[PDB]
Amino acid sequence: SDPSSINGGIVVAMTGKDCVAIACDLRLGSQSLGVSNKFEKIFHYGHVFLGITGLATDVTTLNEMFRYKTNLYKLKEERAIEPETFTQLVSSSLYERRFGPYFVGPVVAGINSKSGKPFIAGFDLIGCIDEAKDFIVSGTASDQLFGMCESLYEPNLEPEDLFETISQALLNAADRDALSGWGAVVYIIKKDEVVKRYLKMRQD
């Protein structure tokens, strides 16, 4: 019935000292039936990352759409798109389907290549932008994530520290959600490098 509770899944992004992290679970189910434990919800265009929760088919479609748009952008602008600009592109793309929206909960994360300033943002299915300075949550366990984040989070964490925090937030929220879990992946992002780590969690 609710397009956002069919496939399940979660995404969470956090800002730290000169870095940002975006994490997600790997589950894809059909209500109670688990179907895939390798459905990643994070994608990237250049140095900009996008995680999408919600109806899987729309998650896939949106990624293909943004890949398409960011490619043409690079060809014309002759530079990779930035976090702030991409966020605007996401918002306007979603609102364009105001009365027949994609059932997703997007999350943007990245570092501005020119200002080095960390950036994260969330959106509702029709484009409303939420530009938090701390964290952003999305998915079937978003209430749980809000609980984890509001407590665990603190400003200016170093990459190695933010990793522990973002992971504990994700992992413990997913274990209180029937439709989340079955694997997890965390992205630690810095101006120069990006590390991707798969976590070990329950498989039930």
Binding site: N7, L28, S30, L33, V35, S36, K38, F39, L55, A56, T57, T60, T61, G100
Partner: protein, 198 residues
């Protein structure tokens, strides 16, 4: 719904699909082949709404055959599945959506590896070692999760399916009248005419 099963072993993809076609109170046919060859090395099985099912399959088949002729080339299984996903993803937001679920089994001659794709009517695609649509997964996935191995031979795959079908024939309320099984490998697509007692 009908039984649609698929398993990807070492060097091939196997699709098993129920043969019954029930309309209301009666089983109208017990030899229905719920499959369409999209290209020499790609096979698609399907289940869903009465007329949409075949209309969709044949529509996809027509498009792939046209591409093959135009380019004198056979699209990779991954390319074919993406084309199919997009068609379904369009359909889901149209006036009257195609209520069809599919399994796409293909052998990629360039990578020399078999591939199995599961896509539901919403355009939800995922690649797997084995998959199914409807309630089929509910009875068989525990068996597949147990006995599945990436290095299985085609013969081992057929034995595992046979086991799955037996579980289905024991616990499922409906009589689906057995299944037709097809293998997809480096040499093409062939049908196992002997599964009625393999």
């Amino acid at each position: 719904m009908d039984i649609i099963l698929g398993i990807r072993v070492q060097d091939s993809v196997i699709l098993a699909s129920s043969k019954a076609v029930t309309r209301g109170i009666s089983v109208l046919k017990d030899s229905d082949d719920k499959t369409r060859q999209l290209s020499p090395h790609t096979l698609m099985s399907f289940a869903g709404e009465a007329g949409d099912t075949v209309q969709f399959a044949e529509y996809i088949q027509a498009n792939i055959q046209l591409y093959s002729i135009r380019e004198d080339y056979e699209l990779s299984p991954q390319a074919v599945s993406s084309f199919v996903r997009q068609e379904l993803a369009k359909s889901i937001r149209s006036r009257r959506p195609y209520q069809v679920n599919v399994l796409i089994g293909g052998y990629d001659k360039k990578k020399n590896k078999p591939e199995l794709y599961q896509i539901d009517y919403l355009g939800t695609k995922v690649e797997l070692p084995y998959g199914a649509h409807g309630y089929s997964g509910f009875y068989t996935f525990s068996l597949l999760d147990h006995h599945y191995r990436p290095d299985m031979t085609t013969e081992e795959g057929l034995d595992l399916l046979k086991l799955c079908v037996q579980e289905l024939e024991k616990r499922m309320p409906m009589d689906f009248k057995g299944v037709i099984v097809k293998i997809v490998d480096k040499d093409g697509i062939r049908q196992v005419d002997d599964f009625q007692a393999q």
